[PDB]
Amino acid sequence: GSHSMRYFFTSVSRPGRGEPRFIAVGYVDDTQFVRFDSDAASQRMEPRAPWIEQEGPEYWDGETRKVKAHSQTHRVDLGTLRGYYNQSEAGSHTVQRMYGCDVGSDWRFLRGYHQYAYDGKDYIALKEDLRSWTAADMAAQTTKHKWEAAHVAEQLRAYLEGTCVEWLRRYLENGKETLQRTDAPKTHMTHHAVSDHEATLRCWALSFYPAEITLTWQRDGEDQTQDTELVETRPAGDGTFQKWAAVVVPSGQEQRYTCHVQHEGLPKPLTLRWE
Amino acid sequence: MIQRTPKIQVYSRHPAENGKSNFLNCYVSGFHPSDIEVDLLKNGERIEKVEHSDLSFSKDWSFYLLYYTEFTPTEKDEYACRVNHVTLSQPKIVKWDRDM
Amino acid sequence: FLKEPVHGV
Predict the structure, then answer these.
(1) Which one in A40, A80, A147, B80 has a CA-CA gap of 20 to 30 Å to A213?
(2) Where in the sequence is the domain holding B95, given as residue range(s)?
(3) Those residues with Cβ within 8 angstroms of residue B7's Cβ, 6 or more apart along the chain or in another chain
């Protein structure tokens, strides 16, 4: 499989209610391993996965150092964008940043990213070539110049192509039991009569990891993408994910519908049918 | 300012079995901004011991969170999720359905 | 493992 390490940062200003809020979370694939919350008591990077709890005091020390470094950078960022967009100082604004790296099945660098948004819209982002920026508006363009002169892409390239993949790998081995485990989907189907001439057919895909999955309904082998309810893949809170696909079916016709399940955990895609 | 409305999923961690303890979940996703009020109810009453995941976001920048609480499903009891966000005129209420 | 340093906008 392909693996990823990602950092999610969220900064939200609170006009007259104190310092801006700063939340940071960090994931390895579909597992969250650490967090930082500007309102938490500790004021340090906390572990959110059992396999990072093993890290020594220096790691926590250094990640807590970096994490509030980021935090400060985001407390200043709220103010610059405000000036850039000529915004009142009365209203709350949101900044969002995301960076990380992807590795292939060989555990080798595949792609590196660094994205930034202001009030839910793309602000500035690092291209796949790690040498050029996508500025959205002129304000983003002033940021682009500034990051060009400070040679930030070069610095970020070394990070995503190196220390990122390097520590991703370490995490992978360190948490081998739950990071390198691929749980196939526990699948099952339900039949609910809606009226005397119709009935709901529900395909279930429970306790799987990773999150990726293809839950499809087909009638007479042809896909029913237009008339199927499909819920977004949701967390079960036990490290696994759940999902379902539902199709309303004319009673006496359950047998021509077939649910299809595609997941890394299965050697072969499942085809279930009501019967 | 962009304002995307929250998707709301109400479900149990494991299949519901009257008598057996579980976790009642309320998944909220795809919203913006991140200010959101989320509660789990039991027969209309607010479930006090409720926790939530740390705030994160998707590719498109919208936020998602997990609210959860330990619970023992019963034949009788009704659970729901009550959610409030700028994009909603009033609190949306979604009832648990063992099958949903 | 977080990245350092981080430049403002």
Answers:
(1) B80
(2) 1-100
(3) A232, B27, B28, B29, B30, B31
Hey, which chains touch C, using 3+ CB pairs under 8 Å?
A: A
Cβ A67–C5 below 8 Å, yes or no?
A: no
Question: Please, where are the H alpha helices in chain B?
Answer: none
Domain with CATH 3.30.500.10 in chain A: 1-181
A130: left (phi over 0), alpha (psi -120 to 50) or beta: left
Name A230's Cβ contacts closer than 8 Å, sequence gap at least 6. Answer: A215, A244, A245, A246
Please name the method used to determine this structure. Answer: X-ray
Q: What is the CATH number of domain A182-270?
A: 2.60.40.10
Q: Note the resolution in Å, 1 decimal.
A: 2.8
B33 and A12 within 8 Å at the Cβ level: the answer is: yes
AA letter at A48: R
Residue B80, strand partner residues:
B41, B95
Rounded to an integer, what distance in angstroms lies between the CA atom of residue A39 and that of residue A121? 25
What's the topology of domain A1-181? 3.30.500
3-class DSSP state for residue A47? strand
Q: B42: domain CATH number?
A: 2.60.40.10
| A2, two tokens | 């392909």
* Cβ atoms of A92 and A21 closer than 8 Å: no
Looking at chain A, the domain(s) classified CATH 2.60.40.10 span 182-270
Q: How far apart are CA B62 and CA B58, in angstroms?
A: 6
